[PDB]
Amino acid sequence: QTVRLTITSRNAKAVESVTSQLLTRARDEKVTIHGPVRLPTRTLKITTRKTPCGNGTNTWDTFELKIYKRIIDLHAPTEQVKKITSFTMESGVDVSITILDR
């Protein structure tokens, strides 16, 4: 069961602060891991007129997000992944991942 990791979180130094750091719990240990690069970045773009009212200089906001997806790939440890992900505590808003395929 080669497993898969999709880490989707916005915030600065989370998407990095797990996959970069926290796979070296598996990366440099008994697991053998297949790193790809993170998938492409998205922006979620809403634009609302700044005026609560009618009057304006016809001005608009543009508000954005960034969602950061990382794919990280494995061979099959059994029950280690349950230990793998659980090694490392450090982040917030970052995403836990349970995947099987092939």
Binding site: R10, L44, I46, T48, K50, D61, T62, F63, E64
Partner: peptide
């Protein structure tokens, strides 16, 4: 109200309602 992405925030405006994680860039 924006339906966009099904977040429905316009009531108290998405300006007053924030911390959604949006930012002001460009």
């Amino acid at each position: 109200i924006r339906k966009y992405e099904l977040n429905v925030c316009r009531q108290c405006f998405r300006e007053n309602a924030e911390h959604i994680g949006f930012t002001k860039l460009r």
